[PDB]
Write a protein that binds this ligand. Structure first.
Ligand SMILES: Nc1ncnc2c1ncn2[C@@H]1O[C@H](CSCC[C@H](N)C(=O)O)[C@@H](O)[C@H]1O
Ligand SMILES: Nc1ncnc2c1ncn2[C@@H]1O[C@H](CSCC[C@H](N)C(=O)O)[C@@H](O)[C@H]1O
Ligand SMILES: [Zn+2]
Ligand SMILES: [Zn+2]
Lengths: 303, 333, 153
C-alpha cells in the first residue's frame, strides 16, 4: 500500500483549476484553469516555470505532447490552442467547435488531436496544420472526456449523456457503445496503458474499469465522492498498481487496482480535489483542488 | 471516392511498410510523401529534374529508392531527403525494387538490358542471367521474403533464380493457350503467404503459388492458381496488385479507367470501381493493411476505402424480421 | 416481379439506398440516397415479430424501463416490435403528404411490413409515410406540408 506524503504545494491560478497533467518526461506539470491561464511548474520541486496565456475564455482541459514539446489547450472560448512548451508560442489556434471545448488529447504519435466540446460533437484535428479533419455527432450531451488508445487506432469518448463510445479513427466508425443498465453521467474516460481496458468515472461516486475485447465492466471502485464535476482518474503504475482519483470530499482517493480496495486517502486539500495527475516515472501525484482551495499538492510515496 | 488536391503531376506512388505514408512521384521530378492519418503531405524531396517512374520504400521505411526518366536512380532518407546514393545506366530503368529482407540490396529492371542487382554498401552489381539472350524486355521481382528472383521475358519465359547465386532454381514458359508466348507485362507477389500474379500481354492475369513452381522444377508445366480477365470487354491491365492480406486482386483498366476486383481462392470478381471517363489511368496500389486503394490517373490521385456496416448503424440492429420465440411460462406469473 | 424476388432485392439494396441524417422535420430521420421510383420497395420495418396479445406486456415493460415503444401493427394478430431489435426504418418521419406508404406482404408465410414509394422519390429527399395514428385527445406535426392536419391525431 502506498504512503504518499505531501512534498510540494502549488498555487497561483486566480480561478478554479480544471486540469493538471504531468509531462511525459516527468519534467513539468501543466495546470489549466478557468482564468484563461495555463501554468507550467517544475515537476519535482514545485518550481513555477511560467504562465502561458492567450486563450479568450476559461480553460477546461490541457494535454501534453508525447515528446514533451507541445501542449494542446481546450478552452471555453470554443477554441483549442497548440503551444510549444519551450517557447510558450501559440503555434496554432483551432477554431471550429461551435460551443465550449471541454477535453483534448493527442494521438500516441502526437501528430493528431481529438477534441470534445459542449456542441456534443467530437472533432478530429491535424497538428502540423491545425486543421479539423473529422467531426462527429458523437453524443446527445456535451462531451466530457476523449482519449486515444495505445496506438491511435481507437478513440474513446464520454459525455454527460452517460454513453461511452469507442470510435474508429481512420473512418470515424462508432465501434462500440458501453452501457451499464442505466444512464450514469460519465464525466471521464480513458484507455488502459495496455489498451486492453477502459477507466470511466460516472457522476455517482463510481469508477468502472471495462474490458474492451469483452465490452463489459471488469472492476468497480467506490468510496470517493463525485457527482457533479469532471474528476480525473489515473493509473498509478510507477509503484504498485493503483487507481488514483479525486473526490468531492476534499480527499485524494487511491484504490488498489486489482482488489479495488482503497489503499490510501491523501488529505490536505480544502476544496474538491478537481484534477489529478500521476507521474510517468516517479511515485509522484499532483492533486489540484477547486477555487475554495486553488492549490496543487505534490505527493510522493515510497512504493 | 476521395482525392487529394495538395499533390500535382502524380505519376507513381508506393505505400510504406505499414500503410501510413505514400511517396508519389511528380512530373517535375519531386517526391511528395503524403500522410494518410493527418491527410497531408509529410515531405517534399527534390529528387530529379526528370519525372520519377519507380519508387520503393525500405523495410525500416527510412530509405526510398527512386528512378528518374534520366536513367538516374537515387536512394533518399525519408527523414532528411538527401540523395544517399546515385547511379546511372544505359537502357533507361523500367523499375527498381529494394530487397525485402536486405535494404542494402536492390534489383533494377532496365529497359533494354537485363535486370541487375546492386548493393548500397558497395557500389557493385550482379547481372542476372537471361534465358533466350534476346528478350530485351524482362521484368523481375523478389519474392515475399527476397529469397528468389522471378524474371519474365517478352516471350512468356519465366525464370526463378536464387537471389544469392542467381542460379536457375525453376523455369517455365507461359502460354497463350494454343501454342504462343505473350509479353510478360509484370510480376507481382503477395506480402503475405506465397501466392503471386503475372500480368501478361494477353490481358489475362495468371495467379500461381511459388511453391508449385519450385516443385515444378526447371522447364515444367505449372498451372496457375487462377486465370483472371475481363471476358466482357477484353481490357488490358496497366497495373495490378494483390490485397494486403492476399485474398483480393485488383486490375486497372486504363482503356476505360476502371478497377476490377476479384478474389484469390474462388477468383470471382468482387466488384468494379469506375473513375472519370476522361482520366487516363496510370498507377494502382493497395493499402497493405487497409481496404484502401490508391489510384493515379492524369496526374491526380484518388482513394478508395471500404467501410463496415457501422458508423451509423450502431438498440440491437437487425436486418430481417424476427419471430418472437414464446416460452412455456411466457404467460405465467 | 415476384414479391419474394422483389423482397430479396429490397433487402440487398436497402443498406445503400437510404440513409439517416439530421432532419428539419425532427431530430434524425430517413433520407433518400438514390432516386427511388414509385411503388418500389423502399424499406422493411424489420424487427421482432410478435403476437398482439403480448404487445401490452412488452409496452408496460418498456413503460417500466422508460424506453420508447417501436411497434407497428402487422394485423389484428401480429406486430413488428422494433423497440429493442430493429433496423433503420425506425427513423422514418411522417408527413401529411407522404411519398411513401406502408403495405404488408406475405413471403413464404411470414408477413413483412414494407414501406414502398407513393411516387418517384429522388436523392436527398426525406422519407415519410402516413402513420395513420388514431385521433387522441394531441401531437403537433411539423411535416411542412400545406395539407398538414396540424396533428397526427
Ligand atoms: N413531424 C413531426 N412533428 C413533430 N414532432 C415530430 C415529428 N416527427 C418526429 N417528431 C418527434 O421526433 C421523435 C422521433 S423518435 C427520434 C428521436 C430523435 N429525433 C432522434 O433522432 O434521436 C418523436 O418522438 C416525435 O416526438
Ligand atoms: N408527424 C409527427 N408528429 C409527431 N411525431 C412524429 C410525427 N411523425 C413521426 N413522429 C415520431 O416518430 C416516432 C415513431 S416511428 C420513429 C421515426 C422517427 N422518424 C425517428 O427518427 O425515430 C414517434 O416517436 C414520433 O415521435
Ligand atoms: Zn405530416
Ligand atoms: Zn402533415
Amino acid at each position: 500500500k502506498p504512503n504518499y506524503a505531501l512534498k510540494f504545494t502549488l498555487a497561483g491560478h486566480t480561478k478554479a483549476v480544471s486540469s493538471v497533467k504531468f509531462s511525459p518526461n516527468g519534467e513539468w506539470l501543466a495546470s489549466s484553469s478557468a482564468d484563461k491561464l495555463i501554468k507550467i511548474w517544475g515537476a519535482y520541486d514545485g518550481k513555477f516555470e511560467k504562465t502561458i496565456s492567450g486563450h479568450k475564455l476559461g480553460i477546461s482541459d490541457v494535454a501534453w505532447s508525447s515528446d514533451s514539446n507541445l501542449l494542446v489547450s481546450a478552452s471555453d472560448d470554443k477554441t483549442l490552442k497548440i503551444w510549444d512548451v519551450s517557447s510558450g508560442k501559440c503555434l496554432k489556434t483551432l477554431k471550429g467547435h461551435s460551443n465550449y471545448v471541454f477535453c483534448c488529447n493527442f494521438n500516441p504519435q502526437s501528430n493528431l488531436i481529438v477534441s470534445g466540446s459542449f456542441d456534443e460533437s467530437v472533432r478530429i484535428w491535424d497538428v502540423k496544420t491545425g486543421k479539423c479533419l473529422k467531426t462527429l455527432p458523437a453524443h446527445s450531451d456535451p462531451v466530457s472526456a476523449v482519449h486515444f488508445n495505445r496506438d491511435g487506432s481507437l478513440i474513446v469518448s464520454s459525455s454527460y449523456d452517460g454513453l461511452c463510445r469507442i470510435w474508429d479513427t481512420a473512418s470515424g466508425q462508432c465501434l462500440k457503445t458501453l452501457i451499464d443498465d442505466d444512464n450514469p453521467p460519465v464525466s471521464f474516460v480513458k484507455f488502459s496503458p495496455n489498451g486492453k481496458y477502459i477507466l470511466a468515472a460516472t457522476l455517482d461516486n463510481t469508477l468502472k474499469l471495462w474490458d474492451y475485447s469483452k465490452g463489459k465492466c471488469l472492476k468497480t471502485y467506490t468510496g470517493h465522492k463525485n457527482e457533479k464535476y469532471c474528476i480525473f482518474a489515473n493509473f498509478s503504475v510507477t509503484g504498485g498498481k493503483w487507481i488514483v482519483s479525486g473526490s468531492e470530499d476534499n480527499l485524494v482517493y487511491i484504490w488498489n487496482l486489482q482488489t479495488k480496495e482503497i489503499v490510501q486517502k491523501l488529505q490536505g486539500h480544502t476544496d474538491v480535489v478537481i484534477s489529478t495527475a500521476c507521474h510517468p516515472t516517479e511515485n509522484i501525484i499532483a492533486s489540484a483542488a477547486l477555487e475554495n482551495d486553488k492549490t496543487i499538492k505534490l505527493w510522493k510515496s515510497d512504493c | 471516392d476521395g482525392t487529394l488536391d495538395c499533390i500535382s503531376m502524380a505519376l507513381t506512388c508506393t505505400f510504406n511498410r505499414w500503410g501510413t505514408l505514400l511517396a508519389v512521384g511528380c512530373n517535375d521530378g519531386r517526391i511528395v510523401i503524403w500522410d494518410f492519418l493527418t491527410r497531408g503531405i509529410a515531405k517534399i524531396i527534390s529528387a530529379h529534374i526528370h519525372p520519377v517512374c519507380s519508387l520503393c520504400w525500405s523495410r525500416d521505411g527510412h530509405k526510398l529508392v527512386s528512378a528518374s526518366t534520366d536513367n538516374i536512380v537515387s536512394q533518399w532518407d525519408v527523414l532528411s531527403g538527401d540523395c544517399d546514393q546515385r547511379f546511372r545506366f544505359p537502357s533507361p530503368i523500367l523499375k527498381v525494387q529494394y530487397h525485402p529482407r536486405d535494404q542494402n540490396k536492390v534489383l533494377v529492371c532496365p529497359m533494354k538490358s537485363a535486370p541487375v542487382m546492386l548493393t548500397l554498401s558497395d557500389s557493385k552489381h550482379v547481372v542476372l542471367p537471361v534465358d533466350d539472350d534476346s528478350d530485351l524486355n524482362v521484368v523481375a521481382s523478389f519474392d515475399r521474403r527476397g529469397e528468389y528472383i522471378y524474371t519474365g521475358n517478352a516471350k512468356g519465359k519465366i525464370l526463378v533464380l536464387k537471389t544469392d547465386s542467381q542460379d536457375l532454381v525453376a523455369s517455365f514458359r507461359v502460354t497463350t493457350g494454343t501454342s504462343n508466348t505473350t509479353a510478360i507485362k509484370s510480376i507481382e507477389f503477395a506480402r503475405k503467404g506465397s501466392c503471386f500474379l503475372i500480368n501478361t500481354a494477353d490481358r489475362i492475369i495468371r495467379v500461381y503459388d511459388g511453391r508449385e513452381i519450385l516443385t515444378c522444377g526447371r522447364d515444367g508445366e505449372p498451372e496457375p492458381m487462377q486465370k483472371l480477365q475481363d471476358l466482357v470487354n477484353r481490357t488490358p491491365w496497366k497495373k495490378c496488385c494483390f490485397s494486403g492480406d492476399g485474398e483480393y486482386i485488383v486490375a486497372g483498366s486504363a482503356r476505360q479507367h476502371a478497377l476490377y476486383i476479384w478474389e484469390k481462392s474462388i477468383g470471382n470478381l468482387v466488384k468494379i470501381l469506375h473513375g472519370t471517363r476522361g482520366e487516363l489511368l496510370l498507377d494502382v496500389a493497395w493499402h497493405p493493411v487497409r481496404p484502401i486503394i490508391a489510384s493515379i490517373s492524369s496526374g491526380v490521385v484518388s482513394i478508395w476505402a471500404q467501410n463496415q456496416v457501422e458508423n451509423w448503424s450502431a438498440f440491437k440492429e437487425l436486418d430481417e424480421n424476427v419471430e418472437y420465440e414464446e416460452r412455456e411460462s411466457e404467460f405465467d406469473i | 416481379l415476384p414479391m419474394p424476388m422483389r423482397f430479396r432485392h429490397l433487402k440487398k439494396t436497402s443498406k445503400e439506398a437510404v440513409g439517416v441524417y439530421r432532419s428539419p422535420i425532427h431530430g434524425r430521420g430517413l433520407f433518400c440516397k438514390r432516386n427511388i421510383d414509385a411503388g418500389e420497395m423502399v424499406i422493411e420495418y424489420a424487427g421482432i415479430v410478435i403476437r398482439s396479445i403480448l404487445t401490452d406486456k412488452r409496452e408496460k415493460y418498456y413503460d417500466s424501463k422508460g424506453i420508447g415503444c417501436y411497434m407497428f401493427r402487422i394485423d389484428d394478430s401480429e406486430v413488428v416490435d422494433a423497440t429493442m431489435h430493429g433496423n433503420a426504418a425506425r427513423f422514418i418521419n411522417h408527413s401529411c403528404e407522404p411519398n411513401c406508404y406502408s403495405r404488408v406482404i406475405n413471403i413464404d408465410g411470414q408477413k413483412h411490413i414494407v414501406i414502398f414509394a407513393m411516387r418517384k422519390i429522388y436523392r436527398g429527399e426525406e422519407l415519410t409515410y402516413d402513420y395513420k395514428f388514431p385521433i387522441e385527445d394531441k401531437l403537433p406535426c411539423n411535416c411542412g406540408a400545406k395539407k398538414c392536419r396540424k396533428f397526427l391525431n
